[PDB]
Amino acid sequence: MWFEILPGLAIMGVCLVIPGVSTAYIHKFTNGGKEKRVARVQYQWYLMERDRRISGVNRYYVSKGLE
Amino acid sequence: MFFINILTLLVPILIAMAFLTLVERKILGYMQLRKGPNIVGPYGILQPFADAMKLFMKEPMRPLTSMSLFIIAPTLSLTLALSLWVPLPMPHPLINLNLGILFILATSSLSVYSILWSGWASNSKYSLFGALRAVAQTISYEVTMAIILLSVLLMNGSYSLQTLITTQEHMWLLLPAWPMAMMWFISTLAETNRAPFDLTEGESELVSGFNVEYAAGPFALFFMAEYTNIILMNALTTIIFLGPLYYINLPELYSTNFMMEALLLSSTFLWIRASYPRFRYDQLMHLLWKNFLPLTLALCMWHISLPIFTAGVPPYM
Amino acid sequence: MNNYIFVLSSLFLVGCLGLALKPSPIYGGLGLIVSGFVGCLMVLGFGGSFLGLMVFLIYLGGMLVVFGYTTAMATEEYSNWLILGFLVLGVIMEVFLICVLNYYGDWLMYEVDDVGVMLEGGIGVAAMYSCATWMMVVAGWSLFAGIFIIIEITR
Amino acid sequence: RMMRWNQERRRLLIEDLEARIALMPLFQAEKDRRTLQILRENLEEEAIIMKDVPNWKVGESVFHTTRWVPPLIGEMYGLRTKEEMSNANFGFTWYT
Amino acid sequence: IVELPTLEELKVEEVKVSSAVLKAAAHHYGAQCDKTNKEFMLCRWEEKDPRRCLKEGKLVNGCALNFFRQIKSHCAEPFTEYWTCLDYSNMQLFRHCRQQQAKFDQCVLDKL
Amino acid sequence: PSTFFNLTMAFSLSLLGTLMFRSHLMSTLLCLEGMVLSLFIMTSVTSLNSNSMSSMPIPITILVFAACEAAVGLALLVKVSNTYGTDYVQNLNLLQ
Amino acid sequence: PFLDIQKKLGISLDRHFMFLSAEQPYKNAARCHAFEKEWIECAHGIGGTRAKKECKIEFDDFEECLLRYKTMRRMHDIKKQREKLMKEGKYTPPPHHSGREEP
Amino acid sequence: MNLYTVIFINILLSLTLILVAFWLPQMLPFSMKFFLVAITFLLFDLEIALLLPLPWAIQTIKTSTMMIMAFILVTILSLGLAYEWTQKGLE
Amino acid sequence: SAFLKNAWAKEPVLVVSFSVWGLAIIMPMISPYTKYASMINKATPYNYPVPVRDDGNMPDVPSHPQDPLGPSLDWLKNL
Amino acid sequence: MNPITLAIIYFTIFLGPVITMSSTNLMLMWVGLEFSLLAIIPMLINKKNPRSTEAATKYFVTQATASMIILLAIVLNYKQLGTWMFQQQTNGLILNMTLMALSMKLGLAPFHFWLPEVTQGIPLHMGLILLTWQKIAPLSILIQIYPLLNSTIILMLAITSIFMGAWGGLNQTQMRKIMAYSSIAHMGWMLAILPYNPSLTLLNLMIYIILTAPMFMALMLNNSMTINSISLLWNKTPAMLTMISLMLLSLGGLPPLTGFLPKWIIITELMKNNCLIMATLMAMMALLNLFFYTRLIYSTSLTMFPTNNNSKMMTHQTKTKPNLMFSTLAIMSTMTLPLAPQLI
């Protein structure tokens, strides 16, 4: 019947979720489990950069009250 | 990593792009009382790969045509389509272009060059007419297409597609602004030269002006482009107007929901094609410079006043 | 690559060179499109976004699009190769001139407010609506008249 | 709903803008302190680069006024690592 | 010449904590330590030069460090939970974390 | 800096163009536009590195006026290849 | 100007934004704002013929805040000769050029 | 740069495909009415460009002014369009 | 009126089109909220509020902004 | 023209010069120039005759490139001084560009080729506007910047114009082009004194306007674009023969009439400034202008050319009258000389 148009769709869907799940986990892996900071405006880039300088070289590492 | 994130977001879309043609040649089929392609492979799954290989193997005829432009137009087409998928705001978008919607609008406009140049390069009368007709309709639908977005943005606060995920945390922008959704949907149908608005390659009226002389590999690249676009524009409808649910804890839900709505609205233009005859050239443009453009202009004002008199100006984050 | 800016400027110059050679009106339109692209790039390079976009959605958009349309209608008849040759001739001469000063990206983003919250291109041009309210009234009158000028000149 | 949501969203926006309003004083000091260091550090190398050059005031305001003219980006990072300069110059246009 | 101040003149203890840490405590720091900062601002504005307010800047920093030492000593755990959740978010938005914020805010009201 | 000299010479190369017709009115109307782009780019560039935001209105006013200017120019062009079947300038020699 | 219908009518549609030191949006001062003031409060009441000789200190400075060419020059020299010192292996960037630092 | 990286892969992927295509298989109009529409496009595009800045103007303290200014822009151009109709120019 | 009627039934876009044009030209003028827009946007603290010299006779916010004196946005709150 | 369009255009052709004059921000001065360019082109092609399209397409290209050059000068200044307006400090080349450009829009000297040709293909009416309400705008921009422009160039463009205008006029027989040529010449005198005493430029213009406006409404009263056509003036309308005679000799510098004052005071001001080289050569070829003016005098008044029988028919019918402006501008022009001291 119409049962059969589903096979094809399944392979479309599966190929349209990969991208959204992929981009959203290759970010939380590269950024240390914390969402990649979105620096829309400079202030944010400043804060981000400030973070880099604060520790290691990468901003994702985040020092706390114990420092 | 970033490279891997380029394979994903590309291949996956290309593989899905292939499966759309199949779900087009079966959904149109069952609507017309026919199984559609099921004999090659299981349930026709290998069917998209099969003609791709035939198309590339068949001779790329070079008519006795400006070669450079003739060959470039296809390249531009695909380049643009794949590019327009870069800033889409599925969760954690590949690239947070701060002015993304503008970027989308920009690249979308550049595509017109392909059809125009293709027709001019083809050097065939049919192609020439196709280009002229195409450029006109394309650009015109761009004029309402852009204004419809400007109305949206003013209620979103920014050009970044990522903001709408925070704008649509309580209600879809269809409820408000539904009148434009319809007008975004019809314009999305024109800009992908799909059926109700497909005078670019009417085939019956004029025979595929865009690719009259294009065959094999060039045919395929635009071809691929059109279908990827078919998805992209539907996906933009599924972010701007139908806002999928989103949860910071679980970012996947968005993608999954984004999938479902994109597939259904992608299914809709497939369903539109089989269901409607094709608008005439004059009729098409009238609808936009006459039936819609006045509608789109006025609501723009209403959407300018709305925030103010409702003191509903959006945050600029 | 500090040279990035100079590189871009050169490309722009070269594109305008082609337009200068006056190739087929369509070739000219194409060349300008390339230059306009280079242009938005340079503006963005300085930091201006909205500004860069404009040329794109205006020049790389219809500005040449209509030209294109137009040409199709009034330009029918296709030495471009010779023109291409002179173009290379100019390129080297252009390069030669820079090589002249050669024998004889250091400072861009000359000054910036590292911390800032409401600075960005477009904000200034957004002041067309407030404290520059005579630019946009005169531009609006320009368009509203231009409608009439074109409708009679075509009439 | 849109009217109420954006009014709420506006309240959140004023809250975090004020959060930096409070924190910028700590940063302003930090910036200046570091800025001067870059200028001075460049002075050291400056006092070691053109020493041989005749008629070479180690350094002198290109201007006449003694007013404090802030340091261009180039001045701060010009002598420094190329990457350092590039980062500052093309480091925002290129997102995180 | 340029009369650029010397390094020893501009060396002072540094806060150096992740920006996130600050944003979470931003509100309170804007509260417990604006006396000196405002004064420093006044100097830095009317007196355009930075050299003319360097010492004030040192005072500016000193005021915050202890601000932190107090919190480290009291209600450190709450604050630690609040910043960690605040940092995970990409724009470090305040509303994603309100449950952690409440416990951090209530405690320091209770102790500090 | 030099960036400006390239743009300025671009405008002069576009100047040499408009002043030396080559039998195509359209091409000229296209060269003319090459200037407006060069002017728009230069105005935007200096406004941007002078941080003079009060002047950004101009970079666009320049384009808005230039667009209509071109609209008029093309309508004359269409008028000419309606009266002479070509845009070729030689045809425009009746006023001798 | 030629016909001052603006001063007469009191309107100021064209004067508020003629120089860099004029009101900037959101009170974000533009670059060089430190000099143009000093170079136009000087030349106010003194006509041009005498805004061109005695008020030359403020333009020679404002001609350098903006163009900022003497700086370019000085620096370029520093660069070239530093190249020569490195040439004689006399000099190489210290960790000062590359090192960790305060927030 | 990140964008540059993505885009060049994008062109490369296309150019690769066209090449494969060619290398593998070795074995006068009178659109006067249109012209007019095209010009209007140019014009309308420019207006839109003057309407693009709104997203930031909505923030202007001088909200009222922005309203008046904006409302005028749309209205005036709307009139232009209507004229086209009134004069039957487009038809 | 009669044409209006047919217009509502023939060419029923323009009618709607104009209607909106007007309704947007009216609601702003009459609205218990119109005033807020210029305030809500005015208030957003984009730029730092530079302090003032406490010379004397100052009714301004007394030092710590937590002090009662000063402007308030309770109007924004509970809006 | 749908009377609405007529209004929009005419308003622009009139808002065009007025914005230029009123504003100080040069940019706003440029768009004033731009609006004049856009408004004039529709009227130029009103007959839409094949000659007309040629006229407008030339006028437009000449006007457009000059407009772009003027903008480049403003754009360059913006970098050499943050100001949007020329100042004492302005680089000399920056100002010279503005002189050349503005001398193209006004059509002076070696850029005098477009004007005679556009004056030939446009109606007599639009001829006046193209000659006199379109010179006010650019001149305003120059007069404002006079302290800064070069005395050498202006003089060269001044002298050249005088010569070109005179020489060109001698051969021409088409009236529209005789006037175009005269305007080039008078425009020359005007730009000669700009560096020294701008106030006299504004006199040598008004008088030119008060002289040319009556002269053209005379040419069109009988709509004669030929001297042969104006020569039969004696039959078509005899009275205007007297004043047409004096106005044309007034346009040239002959002493009893108002036309001498502009040349006389310009010469007095140039000698006061010591250009007794330049002033002398200008006055001398200025005398060439009167020769072609008097040759027309001969044909129209002092000698009666033969006419056509069909003319008796045009006499019968009542002649639509010349507007009042003709008189008030003919007399104030032919004889105000006794009142010169106040004029200057």
Ligand SMILES: CCCCCCCCCCCCCCCCCC(=O)OC[C@H](COP(=O)(O)OCCN)OC(=O)CCCCCCCCCCCCCCCCC
């Ligand atoms: C008060 C505050 C302000 C708000 C005011 C709101 C007032 C109420 C809303 C009024 C407008 C609602 C409709 C908006 C879209 C339609 C606009 C329109 O006027 O239609 C034009 C045209 C029909 O025109 P025609 O039949 O030719 O006759 C014209 C008579 N003037 O339309 C067409 O012909 C379209 C042809 C389409 C062919 C394909 C159809 C596909 C149908 C299925 C998909 C529909 C869209 C799905 C969208 C999903 C979400 C995006």
